[PDB]
Amino acid sequence: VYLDRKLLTLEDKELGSGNFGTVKKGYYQMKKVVKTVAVKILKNPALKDELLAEANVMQQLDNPYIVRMIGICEAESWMLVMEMAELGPLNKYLQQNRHVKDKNIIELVHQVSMGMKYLEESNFVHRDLAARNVLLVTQHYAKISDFGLSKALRADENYYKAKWPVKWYAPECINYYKFSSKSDVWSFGVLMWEAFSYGQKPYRGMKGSEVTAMLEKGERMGCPAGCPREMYDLMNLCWTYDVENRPGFAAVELRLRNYYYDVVN
Numbered sequence: 001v002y003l004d005r006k007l008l009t010l011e012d013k014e015l016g017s018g019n020f021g022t023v024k025k026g027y028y029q030m031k032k033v034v035k036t037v038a039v040k041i042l043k044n045p046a047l048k049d050e051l052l053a054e055a056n057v058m059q060q061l062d063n064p065y066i067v068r069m070i071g072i073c074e075a076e077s078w079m080l081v082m083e084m085a086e087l088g089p090l091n092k093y094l095q096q097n098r099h100v101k102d103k104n105i106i107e108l109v110h111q112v113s114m115g116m117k118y119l120e121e122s123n124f125v126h127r128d129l130a131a132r133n134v135l136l137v138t139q140h141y142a143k144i145s146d147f148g149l150s151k152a153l154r155a156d157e158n159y160y161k162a163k164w165p166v167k168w169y170a171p172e173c174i175n176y177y178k179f180s181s182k183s184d185v186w187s188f189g190v191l192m193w194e195a196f197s198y199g200q201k202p203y204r205g206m207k208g209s210e211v212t213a214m215l216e217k218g219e220r221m222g223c224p225a226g227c228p229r230e231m232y233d234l235m236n237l238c239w240t241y242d243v244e245n246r247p248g249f250a251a252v253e254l255r256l257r258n259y260y261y262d263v264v265n
């Protein structure tokens with residue numbers, strides 16, 4: 001799972017840019033066929049362990065609706081090589097594809113729920129589940145990306161305990177610093193609202209404490225325009241305040257599954 005640098009060929013263009021460095025499109029030369037890849041390149045304080053951690057999480061993961069890691073490449077700077085989802089972030093796609101029918105959005109978010117169902121079974125917490133971190137291969141095929149804040153849970157516990165996306169975070173994450181798969185279900189609820197709002201930002205114009213204050217009164221984001229009423233119930237079900245009463249992805253996937261096939265039938 002260590003890749004040869006002379007086989008890789010990177011573009012000059014950047015896809016994304018953070019403190020890590022860059023994300024660039026490229027081509028990894030396989031047996032005969034050449035595979036297209038998205039490569040996360042590094043920019044020097046020992047934040048190289050953070051990248052190794054992300055690679056180590058993706059190494060263990062293996063699922064249709066998760067971004068696959070091809071391997072690591074030590075050359076000039078550290079590089080996390082992944083398979084290429086050509087259409088990009090879900091939020092940005094839906095922003096500039098308003099024609100996308102509501103059936104198609106149910107399909108795309110149900111795919112995310114199945115990836116998180118696997119993530120829950122595999123005992124990993126994502127901790128950054130947003131519409132920006134869902135990448136599209138096709139209009140009808142999504143993958144969950146960005147495992148930089150992801151943690152593998154121990155066999156005895158069922159939460160991790162700790163620059164946060166407060167708008168995607170559950171009450172227990174803000175108050176108690178406790179991250180479980182139920183905390184990701186909360187984030188999936190915000191991700192659903194994002195998708196049915198066509199990539200609109202949640203809690204628009206509000207600060208973290210104002211969002212925290214709003215949610216404590218029992219006030220939740222309203223049903224976005226054209227969103228099916230059964231899908232909006234699932235958002236509010238994902239936004240259960242109590243951690244224990246909130247459903248896991250098994251339940252979230254099962255409702256999205258059943259509802260989806262009453263639309264296509």
Ligand SMILES: Cc1cn(-c2ccnc(Nc3cc(C)c(OCCN4CCCC4)c(C)c3)n2)cc1CN1CC(O)C1
Nearest residue numbers: 015016023038040083084085086087088089132133146
């Ligand atoms: C670690 C990582 C892997 N990737 C990946 C992983 C696999 N595939 C891709 N493909 C991809 C990724 C992006 C960010 C993307 O948008 C760049 C295209 N946008 C259009 C105009 C500005 C850039 C497109 C069209 C394709 N990215 C992205 C990231 C960074 N995450 C994505 C999240 O938004 C920040």
